[PDB]
Structure 1
């Protein structure tokens, strides 16, 4: 019971690490998309104003 309790705690920490990394990477995924939206909006706006 002492050994399996620490086994449960270590698999919980492994899950917690997994959770930690994924959350960071969805944030990282989000970061890339937003900056691409900003770059796309700026280039469209800029190109039509210079034509104007």
Structure 2
């Protein structure tokens, strides 16, 4: 059980780290989405302002 506790500690560490990685890649994606929305709003704003 001592070596099983060793393996448990290591597996728990790596599971927590791979669980954090999905939170991060999620933030990166949200970012990529919201910046695209901002760029598109800016583009349409330019179109209307220049047409005026």
Unaligned residue ranges in structure 2 (runs of 5+): none
How high is the TM-score relative to the length of structure 2?
Answer: 0.91
CA offsets per residue over residues 11-42 of structure 1, 9 Å max, x none?
11111110121111000001100100000000
CA–CA distance in structure 1, aligned partners of residues 4 and 29 of structure 2: 37
2:30 is the alignment partner of 1:26: no
CA–CA distance in structure 1, aligned partners of residues 6 and 30 of structure 2: 36
Runs of 4+ in 1 over 6 A off after TM superposition: none
Unaligned residue ranges in structure 1 (runs of 5+): none
Aligned positions, number: 52
Partner of 1:42: 42
**Pairwise CA RMSD of aligned residues?**
0.8
